[PDB]
Amino acid sequence: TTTATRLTGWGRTAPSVANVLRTPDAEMIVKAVARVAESGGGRGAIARGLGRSYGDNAQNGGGLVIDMTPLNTIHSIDADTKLVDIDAGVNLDQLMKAALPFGLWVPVLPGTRQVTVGGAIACDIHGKNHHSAGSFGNHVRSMDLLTADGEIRHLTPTGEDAELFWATVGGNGLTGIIMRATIEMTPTSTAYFIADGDVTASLDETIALHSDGSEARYTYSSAWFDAISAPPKLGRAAVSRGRLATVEQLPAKLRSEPLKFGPIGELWYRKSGTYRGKVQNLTQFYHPLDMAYGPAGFLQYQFVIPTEAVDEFKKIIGVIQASGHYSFLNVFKLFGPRNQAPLSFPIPGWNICVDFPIKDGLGKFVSELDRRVLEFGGRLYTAKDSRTTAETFHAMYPRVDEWISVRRKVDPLRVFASDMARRLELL
Ligand SMILES: Cc1cc2nc3c(=O)[nH]c(=O)nc-3n(C[C@H](O)[C@H](O)[C@H](O)COP(=O)(O)OP(=O)(O)OC[C@H]3O[C@@H](n4cnc5c(N)ncnc54)[C@H](O)[C@@H]3O)c2cc1C
Ligand SMILES: COCCN1CCN(C(=O)c2nc3cc(C(F)(F)F)c(C)c([N+](=O)[O-])c3s2)CC1
Known part of the structure; x- marks a missing residue:
């Protein structure tokens, strides 16, 4: 049932034509993988x-x-x-809606709820609650992986095959196809958050707010970041922090159904940006993230700098604003402890996601950012990358050789392959 289709990422860049299989029959997917294995590998197969x-x-x-x-x-x-037991193709929006009546909450939610469980594991996704909860991989209790040999492996985070489990987490589909998984959810009594809002004036006090220990008081924390204004205004942030609400914290009107789902403006946004104990629904707490592809002519760039390299991080921010490249929408948060997945993006430290409009000199400038991020012990995120080199990636991920070793044991004939795998020499 495979049909030739032109495929791009969300950034609408680097298009390539491939045969796309679309079937709800698990057995047809098993046969398709077996067909590629009989062909010796060829160009290979990747999940989507x-x-x-x-x-x-x-x-x-x-x-x-x-x-x-x-x-x-x-x-x-x-x-x-x-525990929830789901097929890899169910999305986080669907899972969120289904799990709420059980008093359960999706343990890690990204900026959009339009991601699959398979995509969530393969990119080891993170959310507003990383510092308290880790990434998506931390909450997978088991997964059924269709490997190159045609066999479906039941993988667990500990015990036998644990190494393959952790190579699959953040593995970008290169260990096989996740068909099914068990996720441990977070218990909740409401679908609401209790939020504290703060507005900082500078990069210095943005960093100070994240270093004063107040982060330990909130399970959820992220900020909107200024990367255009000149110092000291550079790095000023609207910080949104909170935790899941309990029933009695809700206004009476909501208590019946707790689990149901310019210069003048800036003045206001400074005043209305400071608040304590505000009840917010999912949409409001993540606002304005609610407002078939994203806009073309934009280059998404996300990197994390280790906590200790704070001066190094401050310098990169300065380089970005003095560049001539302007990004209006910037998400900033301090990551918590990493997990044991070799290719997992998040490490403890300063994470920022910037969005540059595609312009002259952009590509070579972000190559200079790569080098800076690399030098200072940081890394970029695969789920946002389409242009960095194998050399840079391998140096950014010192456990990459460890991962490749696992990949070669599970897929010797290179049955699973993608444009990224070839580009970053993970194939
Ligand atoms: C607006 C927006 C906001 C975002 N915010 C965040 C954020 O806050 N935090 C964050 O971490 N990420 C974020 N992302 C990125 C996104 O969460 C990841 O890229 C995610 O992996 C995409 O899921 P998907 O189902 O679209 O997978 P795809 O994009 O289709 O595929 C991504 C990878 O997953 C693999 N894969 C997919 N399904 C399977 C399967 N069944 N078995 C094996 N491998 C599979 C593919 O091989 C591929 O390598 C954001 C993206 C957008 C567009
Ligand atoms: C309409 O354009 C707005 C830009 N969007 C917001 C920034 N983009 C993202 O991919 C991200 N969304 C979130 C959303 C969050 C959130 F806080 F969980 F919501 C976090 C913590 C990050 N992050 O990396 O720290 C990101 S990165 C790109 C899309």
């Missing part, structure tokens, strides 16, 4: 979720791409064990 990754990890030029979104069955949700 909802295509929300900006880069080229979910495309395979001249090869096979398997669309996983038809596998969207939620098998079971259990309130006692807090």
Whole structure:
């Protein structure tokens, strides 16, 4: 049932034509993978979720791409064990809606709810609550992985095959196809947050606010970041922090249904940006994230700098604003401890996501950012990358050789392959 399709990431860049399989039948996907294995490998096969990754990890030029979104069955949700058993193609919006009546909450939510469970694991996604909860991989209790040999492995975070489990987490689909998974959810009594808002005046006090220990008082924390204004205004931020509300914290009107889902403006945004104990629904707490692809002519760039290299981070921010490249929408947060996945993006430190409009000199400038981020012990995120080099990536991820070793043991014939894998020499 494979049909030739032109495929891009969310950034609408680096297009490549591939045969796309779209079937809700698990057995047809098993046979398709076996067909590629009989061909000796050839150009290979990669899975694809909802295509929300900006880069080229979910495309395979001249090869096979398997669309996983038809596998969207939620098998079971259990309130006692807090476990959900879902097909890899169900998305986080669907899962959120289904789990709420059980008093359960998706443990890690990204900027958009239009991502699959498969895409969430393969990119080891992070959210507003990383410092308290880690990334998506931390909450996977088991996953069924279709490997190159045609076998479906039941993988767990500990015990036998634990190394393959952690190579799959953040593995960008290069260990096989996640068909099914069990996620441990977070218990909640409401669908609401209690939020404290703060507005900083400078990069200095933005960093001070994140270093004074106040982060330990909130499970959820992220900020909108100024990367255009000259110092000391550079790095000023609207910080939104909070935790899941309990029932009695809700206004009476909401208590019946707790689990139901210019210069003058800046003056206001400074005043209305400071608040304490505000009840907010999911949409409001993530606002304005609510407002088939994203806009073309934009280059998404996300990197994290280790906590200790604070001066190094401050310098990169300065380089960005003095560059002639302007990014209006910037998300900033302090990451918590990393997990044991070799290719996992998040490490403890200063994370920022910037959005440059595609202009003359941009490509070579972000190459200079790569070098700076690399020098200072940081890394960029694969789910946003389509232009960095193998050399830079390998140096940014010192456990990459460890990961490649696992990949070669599970896929010797290179049955699983993508545009990213070839570009970053992970193939
Ligand atoms: C507006 C926006 C906001 C975002 N905010 C955040 C954020 O806050 N935090 C964050 O971490 N990320 C964020 N992202 C990125 C996004 O969460 C990831 O790129 C995610 O992996 C995309 O999910 P997807 O289902 O679209 O997967 P795709 O983009 O289709 O694929 C991505 C990778 O997952 C693999 N994959 C997909 N399904 C399977 C499967 N069944 N088995 C094996 N491998 C599979 C593919 O091989 C590919 O390598 C954001 C993206 C957008 C567009
Ligand atoms: C309409 O254009 C707005 C730009 N959007 C916002 C920034 N973009 C993103 O990919 C991100 N969304 C979020 C959303 C969050 C959130 F706080 F969880 F919501 C976090 C913590 C990050 N992050 O990397 O720290 C990001 S990065 C790109 C899309």
